[PDB]
Amino acid sequence: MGELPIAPIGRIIKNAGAERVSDDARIALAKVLEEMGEEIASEAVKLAKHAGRKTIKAEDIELARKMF
């Protein structure tokens, strides 16, 4: 948790069509995306270990995302 920088998150909300954005909404969306990222990456670690690898690959992320 707390990995994403806040300035890029406000650009996500502006690019989605917001006129103005509070810094409290940037912190809220960063928390949602870091939680979703942790859930998908923990499934991807298990998929890589099931495949016999130590490296997480794109295919592990794509398959993990389909579990959600």
Answer with the entry of a second copy, Cl ion, none that 17 interacts with (C-beta below 5 to 8 A by kind): a second copy
Under the criterion CB under 5 A, does residue 53 sit at the interface with Cl ion?
Answer: yes
3 binds a second copy (CB under 8 A): yes
Nearest to 26 by CA among 39, 2, 44, 7: 7
**How far is it, in rounded angstroms, from Cα 14 to Cα 5?**
16
Are residues 48 and 57 in contact, defined by beta-carbon separation less than 8 angstroms? yes
* CA atoms lying within 13 Å on the CB side of residue 49: 5
Closest distance of CB 50 from a second copy, Å: 14
Interface residue list for a second copy (CB under 8 A): 1, 3-5, 8-9, 11-13, 15-22, 24-25, 27-29, 32-34, 36-38, 40-42, 44-45, 48, 54-58, 60-62, 65
